[PDB]
Amino acid sequence: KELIVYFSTQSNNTHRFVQKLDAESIRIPIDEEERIKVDEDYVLIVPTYSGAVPKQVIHFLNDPDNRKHCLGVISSGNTNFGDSFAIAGPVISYKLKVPLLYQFELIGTKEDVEEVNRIISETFNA
Amino acid sequence: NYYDRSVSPVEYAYFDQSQNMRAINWNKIVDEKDLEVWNRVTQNFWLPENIPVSNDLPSWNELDDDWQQLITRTFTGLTLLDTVQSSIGDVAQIKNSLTEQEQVIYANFAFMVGVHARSYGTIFSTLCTSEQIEEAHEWVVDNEALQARPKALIPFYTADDPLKSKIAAALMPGFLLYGGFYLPFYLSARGKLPNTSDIIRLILRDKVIHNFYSGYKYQLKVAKLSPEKQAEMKQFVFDLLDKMIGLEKTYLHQLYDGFGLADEAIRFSLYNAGKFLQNLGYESPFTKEETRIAPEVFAQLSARADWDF
Numbered sequence: 543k544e545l546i547v548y549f550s551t552q553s554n555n556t557h558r559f560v561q562k563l564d565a566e567s568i569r570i571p572i573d574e575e576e577r578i579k580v581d582e583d584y585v586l587i588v589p590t591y592s593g594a595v596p597k598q599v600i601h602f603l604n605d606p607d608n609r610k611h612c613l614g615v616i617s618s619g620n621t622n623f624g625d626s627f628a629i630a631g632p633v634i635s636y637k638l639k640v641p642l643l644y645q646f647e648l649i650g651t652k653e654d655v656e657e658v659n660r661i662i663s664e665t666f667n668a
Numbered sequence: 669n670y671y672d673r674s675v676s677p678v679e680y681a682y683f684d685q686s687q688n689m690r691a692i693n694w695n696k697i698v699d700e701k702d703l704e705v706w707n708r709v710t711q712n713f714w715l716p717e718n719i720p721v722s723n724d725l726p727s728w729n730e731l732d733d734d735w736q737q738l739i740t741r742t743f744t745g746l747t748l749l750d751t752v753q754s755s756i757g758d759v760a761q762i763k764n765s766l767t768e769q770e771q772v773i774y775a776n777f778a779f780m781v782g783v784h785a786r787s788y789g790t791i792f793s794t795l796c797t798s799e800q801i802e803e804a805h806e807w808v809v810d811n812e813a814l815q816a817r818p819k820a821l822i823p824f825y826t827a828d829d830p831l832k833s834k835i836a837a838a839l840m841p842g843f844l845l846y847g848g849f850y851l852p853f854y855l856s857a858r859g860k861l862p863n864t865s866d867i868i869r870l871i872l873r874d875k876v877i878h879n880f881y882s883g884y885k886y887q888l889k890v891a892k893l894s895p896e897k898q899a900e901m902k903q904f905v906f907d908l909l910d911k912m913i914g915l916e917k918t919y920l921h922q923l924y925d926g927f928g929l930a931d932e933a934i935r936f937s938l939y940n941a942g943k944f945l946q947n948l949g950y951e952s953p954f955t956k957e958e959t960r961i962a963p964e965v966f967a968q969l970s971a972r973a974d975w976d977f
């Protein structure tokens with residue numbers, strides 16, 4: 543019943559991180575002509591591109607049926623962006639009124655996988 | 669299709685004169701990621717002559733002649749690395765492009781790394797004497813530990829293996845300069861040379877995308893090779909990273925000798941070595957102990973570490 547909804551561009555950094563996690567995952571389509579419907583609660587995992595939130599994630603969350611099932615957000619990016627590091631998480635947190643659970647870089651480290659696996663378990667029991 | 673029966677001019681010039689040349693097409697784009705990167709680096713255009721470094725004079729003047737000389741040498745070290753990547757490294761990538769837009773993006777990289785090198789000159793113009801400036805150039809030329817690093821990457825740029833050239837091109841913005849970038853962040857955590865730190869954050873906002881792009885294009889090419897030749901390329905990456913980590917550790921131990929920074933600077937270096945590996949699609953084998961730096965120093969890098977409703 544642990545579920546992840548994620549977005550990842552052609553570079554597939556977020557995709558590859560999510561595949562290292564235990565929880566089942568559903569991918570938001572890159573093609574803006576395509577949409578998904580999610581009928582179960584989920585943790586959202588998205589990268590940052592600063593329009594800090596990818597347009598395809600806005601389209602996903604713009605469906606009230608989809609955004610009602612969000613149990614919080616994890617955001618990725620690169621610390622070299624400074625004040626812009628992983629700000630997709632905060633922006634989504636404020637819009638949905640849901641907790642920012644974690645922040646990570648590129649395809650994630652061994653530590654990130656352990657902490658996110660734990661935080662997803664604790665988020666679905668809380 | 670015109671595209672499949674023609675070559676880019678750079679393909680025509682170096683690899684295949686048998687076909688006619690096609691103009692770049694910005695209306696029909698093979699890879700949308702090229703447009704994302706092109707838009708970002710061009711909209712992020714900046715010049716160091718538009719950052720006021722003269723507000724660093726009060727904090728600069730309070731540093732003794734030991735720290736001043738270290739800043740001038742370190743920055744002159746970074747200038748050399750940028751000069752290598754601008755004159756050799758990034759322009760060498762153009763002919764090995766997968767897409768038409770990639771050729772133009774690497775022309776932007778070459779130019780902008782040139783602006784990075786130039787940014788150190790503007791810092792020196794405002795802060796440093798003629799003597800401090802000239803001493804740093806002598807020191808850079810006569811420092812074998814410093815010279816060894818660029819001397820190890822340059823042959824990959826001039827040789828005929830495009831993937832090893834690509835890994836080298838990713839290694840420069842991804843790893844080699846961070847040991848030096850530690851110093852300005854160290855000082856700006858102590859309220860010293862804060863304007864100088866703004867130029868470094870602008871440089872790194874460019875470096876991060878250079879590293880990502882070269883690593884992304886590396887991954888597209890290795891995916892097409894057999895499992896055997898993929899494992900052989902992974903071997904070369906870690907073998908080269910091992911050699912460059914070795915050379916960098918040696919250099920930093922001499923550079924920071926007496927200032928007691930080397931340890932922290934090397935840990936910062938390996939944090940970015942891990943990021944270099946992730947940008948090429950390999951896991952970071954580095955532990956939290958090997959890559960940890962003081963929060964106050966890391967905060968100088970990043971302080972963070974269509975809608976219908």
Ligand SMILES: Cc1cc2nc3c(=O)[nH]c(=O)nc-3n(C[C@H](O)[C@H](O)[C@H](O)COP(=O)(O)O)c2cc1C
Pocket residue numbers: 549550551552553554555556557589590591592618619620621623626627628629647648649704705708877880
């Ligand atoms: C053009 C561009 C802009 C980016 N902007 C940001 C940013 O503002 N903040 C951040 O933390 N990371 C930023 N990143 C880094 C990406 O979020 C990071 O590479 C991420 O791992 C990509 O995930 P994906 O491969 O799933 O798309 C940017 C990367 C690119 C290429």
